[PDB]
A paper describes a structure:
The papillomaviruses (PV) are small dsDNA tumour viruses of significant medical importance and the prototype of the group is bovine PV (BPV-1). The N-terminal half of BPV-1 E1 consists of a regulatory domain (residues ∼1–158) and a sequence specific origin of replication (ori) DNA binding domain (ori binding domain; OBD, residues ∼159–300), implicated in replication initiation. The C-terminal half (residues ∼301–605, the E1 helicase domain—E1HD) has helicase activity and can be sub-divided into the oligomerization domain (OD, residues ∼308–378) and the AAA+ adenosine triphosphatase (ATPase) domain that includes a flexible C-terminal acidic tail (AT, residues 579–605) required for helicase processivity. Crystal structures of the E1HD show hexamers with two tiers formed by the OD and the AAA+ domain.
To advance understanding of the mechanism of dsDNA strand separation we have used electron microscopy (EM) and single particle analysis to obtain structures of the full length BPV helicase E1 and two complexes of E1 bound to a RFJ end-labelled with protein tags. First, a structure of the purified E1FL–T30 complex examined by negative stain EM was determined with C6 rotational symmetry imposed during the initial structure determination. The E1FL hexamer structure, determined at a resolution of 18 Å, has a maximum diameter of 130 Å and a height of 100 Å and can accommodate ∼410 kDa of protein mass, in agreement with the predicted 409 kDa. The shape of the complex resembles a triple-tiered ring, with the middle ring having the larger diameter and the upper ring the smallest (left). There is a central tunnel (‘a’) that varies in diameter along its length: at the bottom of the structure (C-terminus) the tunnel is ∼20 Å in diameter; travelling upwards the tunnel ‘a’ forms a chamber within the HD area, which expands to 27 Å below sub-domain 3 (middle) and then it narrows to 23 Å in diameter at the entrance to the central tunnel formed by the upper ring. Third, available atomic coordinates of E1 domains were docked into the EM maps. The fitting resulted in a CCC = 0.72, which was reduced to ∼0.2 for the upper tier of the complex indicating a better consistency between E1HD crystal structures and the lower tiers of the E1FL structure. DNA unwinding is therefore taking place at the entrance to the helicase domain, inside and not outside the hexamer. Our observations therefore suggest a revision of the steric exclusion model proposed for E1 (20) where, alternatively, DNA strands are wedged apart within the hexameric assembly and not outside.
Author numbering:
A (entry chain B): 301 to 305, 310 to 549, 556 to 578
B (entry chain A): 301 to 305, 310 to 550, 554 to 579
C (entry chain F): 301 to 305, 310 to 549, 556 to 579
D (entry chain E): 301 to 305, 310 to 551, 556 to 578
E (entry chain C): 301 to 305, 310 to 548, 556 to 578
F (entry chain D): 301 to 305, 310 to 549, 551 to 579
Write the structure that this text describes.
């Protein structure tokens, strides 16, 4: 690598935006590479304030990306996500899986249609069963397709562990333990309902925002438990009982899924 | 988007304020687009300190907006909130819902009249019942119409969670648990009395303001419990016992409140 | 509002000080208005670092205002609280309330006189009686008039609860629970006796100071309970027996009270 | 407080130091008043970066006061505190009290002597007795004269409650409870033996220091208690039994000044 | 050292990067030394802003270093790690040791092949047994060879104790006590699984990132414990029963990977 | 003082480094004193950003001091520590003491030789016995000589209470209570082993570093206790049974010069050679 040797900020931002580079380290490094055949990248390594520029660039790209994502309605967004996916794919992969778990695909379609609209008390789908039934498998593939974020309950003692909810269009909590379910029960009923919530962000002001659609995987059946009574109404449960690993849903599978079931998932 | 090829900050703030953009994300993006015509927006994209300008702009805007909003009387405010509410709607759906819960709309009206003026011991309305009775949905629709804020007891361990009581004209604590009621019982006593309290910040300023009218929803009946005796006379309870467990469930909207308020403006002592 | 179009900061601060604006948002807004008729306010809107100037102006103002009030004598401070409070006012309001709860006015005037002077053992007046006898009512009204602060002792979690004491001329402990009294009994004798106490604050250094005068409200009669023997000589109880559900004390009432009884409260400056 | 109509920071810091103002709001307000008859104070209000200077200034003065207090030997330090002592009392006021509490001046003078040097196991003087025997009275008067600091065991749940030990030359832990004494036993053995303790400070990294001289008051006799065996050889105790109660004793700063000026020899402060 | 005496930042960074100096103190000091025979190092000591240059340099180097590590495939990465190792070595050292613990090397090769790919439920290998059975010994040597990071559960009450997971290609938790296993069970199943995980960085904002392969050493057999039921499926256990001290070097691992390249599916 | 009245930062740092002043208040005050006969110190008092320069100076010094301490090997480091010690001394002071505690000096030498190399499971020496047996006495004198740091278990609820491990070459925990041993057992086995650990530092970034050699003094005998089973293999215990005081005198007191004598004499057997 070379980092040695008039700089325009905007151009670097343009570049960063185009390549979807949102991360300070990647932006810095990847631009320093562009330096061999880019006079602006060359100029960037000539400035003594490159550190700040990398920082401001990431801020700037984050601003734009966030703003784009927020502007789109769910259909237009899924549309963009479909455009993004590549590879061989079939909704039949998804069908087969649900059929393997002895679930009619329509049951999922119905729930998914409403989940996507973020309708109160329907804003949370939970995939529940004994280990190795493709729960994490499925939810992760979908969250990936959608460009959703994973929430890490491991960081719940922090104020900003929910900060991504100010940006993403769907979110996942993977392997909700009893501690996890209780926290949700106590503090995050409104977020599970998909009502507005005050979201704390690092260098920014708090935003009040509709908590986006939620996914949860767990071994714990909330509907069956009396002590999670108040969650019964806001959580739709899909029970995955059958063992699997082979079964492997790609992005292209979801692309196929949404394209096939566009009308049937009500996406006007 | 295009973010490339002297700047005046005040001009950007003017634009942002007029368009009422107070989020950096939006200010950043939207101004970048306005670069084709408006050539201050063009100057903006040629500065190496774009990021700061966005930051500062959001600050500057939300300063002004907060400041006009405090300057308004509750009447004049609700007015702006009606002016802001769009779509087709009717107060009948509010009537329908209370009557559904076997409550006369006039019981609600009375309470609301006093609650809007923030009268001592009338400052907090609670909607209490078993799960699925329209508590959250009623309150949220109101708070939404009112432009109020939703406090999250999740962050309660840091007093900073009440920061927004400094800014907004009404607040909701959605789904109060015992823990949360106990919190009211020790701290927010003064809020339920009209005597000012001290609100803190991450950007530490440490002001003192009269507390905005509160809404609470809860599965816990406070009037029924002695460990919450103080709150009995200071919290007005509306018991919702009828469930709505059966495509889109029932929904109150901005327009529904808009008409509710235009129709009942008189009876609500909002006259000026 | 107009926010568009050489700037002198001190001038802005001067202005802000004059209008008593300590409020970033208010400052920002009000200056931008007073601007088609102030060369400096206009100049402010020309500057790119407006956001900084507002922040600094606030800081600067809250410094001056804070420091100017910290420097007053107790009498001078009350004279300030008197100027600051306006409205429909009579002390007759208070006198009848005391008469309703069967407390002689002079008992209270005296006690207050010595309380405002923060003499040890005279430093803490408790108001005691069963729920709903206007204890909060009265104390809040007084502390408000005086611009003091309100403290709630929760339990353990209340670690920083005394943090405001670092700063106010007076304070009120709202509904002292039994544990709150034990806290006094255990950790606060020095405060009551006129000695320095370390007061922990959030994200700044602890401070050592003489405890401001304290009002307390409680259902617990510390004079009666021998397990608080040590507070008996340090706390002066006013017993409120009569339930009230009309009475309402105001900033304007206290004003009249203080102006009327000025000579009798020994505030002679 | 007129604020309107080339600034040297030095001149300001100086002014703040001279007047021993360490606290921003005071510094700001007080300098603004000086501006009537002070060119640099006048130049200050002409600056756009006033807030920055007021901050810096506080930080600057805080640095100096803190570091000069640390730099002086215990005798020179006491010497300084004698110069600060205003009014006029007498060392006799102090002697009279000890006479009343039936304790030996000589015992005290020695204890204090060694306590002042912070000699291992001589570093902590307990003042023990039932309530209202003038324990707080005497200890606080001594701390005051000394420029000491009070530690509140109330704040012990934060470990920052000891922060001031990285600063004072003498410290008082008032009204020790059992909780507190076994705290000492548990955590502070090194403070008593004159070995190093890591004292955590809030906004900056912890420092290792030798704990300055310590006073304690308490209703609890550590020497008479078995669970504090370690403490017996490290804590020098004095029992006060005598009431101090009229709706009579008030040791002043001048009292202490006279005490030290007069027993200077006997305290080994040469 | 000498600290007194036109500065170019980029050259300093270049330098720091070349020497792989990533931390402020080292950078500052080591550069101040270069000052005798480097005009840019000389010019650095002439600036009144050297403090922030050292700071920014560190920032800039970790940007680059992180970015170049993240860019490499696991094969390409191990390749570079092999290039880095020096000295005398043999995979036999490793074979001998697994054989000593009565474990066929192929069992380990199979597990490692998958672990390196970060396959779900296969992302975590645990070395388990009574004290002094070369558990920490082996895991540490591997983590060293790989340039992986240590996690310190001692800091688990902080938000940033997992912050290295945003940078390393492999991680180790050494001596998981019961408290440690429980924390993992409660909060980090997905991390163990090697699914995407939101990782809180100190002054930057969080990143969503796939969790690197994991090594744990412990006296606690999770597989045998009913209360760690939910960990059974995501943790492959290697039981080290035999005591010992013997040592595995970088060059041993270099030998190991080179020899077993194809058998490890490193194309 | 006089705090009043062009500046070169490097020179102030040079100064601060030379005087090994690393701590902001000392740096500011001490330099303000140098102002009488130093034009750079005089210029410092003329700038408006003194507060910052003091701040940056401390940063810079800390950088240099840490960096130079980490660069040295253990031998070269002890070497520099010997150079630093002054006064009358003899290793016999040390011998006499161990002999007084009925311990052969060679037992300690053997342990120390390995402890200094920071060999796994040998990275921690605990001195254990009833009160007043010179445990803290000895450990502190050694830590002092080595320029090691003391960890204070009073601060253990903070992330940063271990922050010194990123800097010192030896470290001591004095008077380990039961709470203390348990914390070590639960959270800190591998640091007791002297394996790489992630040490969190306050304002800066966490650092991954080899945990330095450890000393512990305690009234609690971990080897005898079944509940500290897993500490048995990583802690070498020296039992001090004999009193080191009556509260007349205190006969045993090891100086820096005693250790200087100790290491110089026993350089070979501690394998601190080429
Ligand atoms: Mg799973
Ligand atoms: Mg609800
Ligand atoms: Mg191990």
């Amino acid at each position: 690598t070379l980092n040695e040797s008039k700089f325009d900020f905007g151009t670097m931002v343009q570049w960063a935006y185009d390549h979807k580079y949102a991360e300070e380290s990647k932006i810095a490094y990847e631009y320093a590479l562009a330096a061999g055949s880019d006079s602006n990248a060359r100029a960037f390594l000539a400035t003594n304030s490159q550190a700040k520029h990398v920082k401001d660039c990431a801020t700037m790209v984050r601003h734009y990306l966030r703003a784009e994502t927020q502007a789109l309605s769910m259909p237009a967004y899924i549309k963009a996500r479909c455009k993004l996916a590549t590879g061989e794919g079939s909704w039949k992969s998804i069908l087969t899986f649900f059929n393997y778990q002895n679930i009619e695909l329509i049951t999922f379609i119905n729930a998914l249609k409403l989940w996507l609209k973020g309708i109160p008390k329907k804003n949370c789908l939970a995939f529940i069963g004994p280990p190795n039934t493709g729960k994490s498998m499925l939810c992760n593939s979908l969250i990936h397709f959608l460009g959703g974020s994973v929430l890490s309950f491991a960081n719940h003692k922090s104020h900003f562990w929910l900060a991504s909810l100010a940006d993403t269009r769907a979110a996942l909590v993977d392997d909700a333990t009893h501690a996890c379910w209780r926290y949700f029960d106590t503090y995050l009923r409104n977020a599970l309902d998909g009502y507005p919530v005050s979201i704390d962000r690092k260098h920014k002001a708090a935003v009040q925002i509709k908590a986006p659609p939620l996914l949860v995987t767990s071994n714990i059946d909330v509907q069956a438990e009396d002590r999670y009574l108040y969650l019964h109404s806001r959580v739709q449960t899909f029970r995955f009982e059958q063992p699997c690993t082979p079964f492997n849903i790609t992005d292209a599978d979801w692309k196929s899924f949404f394209v096939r079931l566009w009308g049937r998932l009500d996406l006007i």
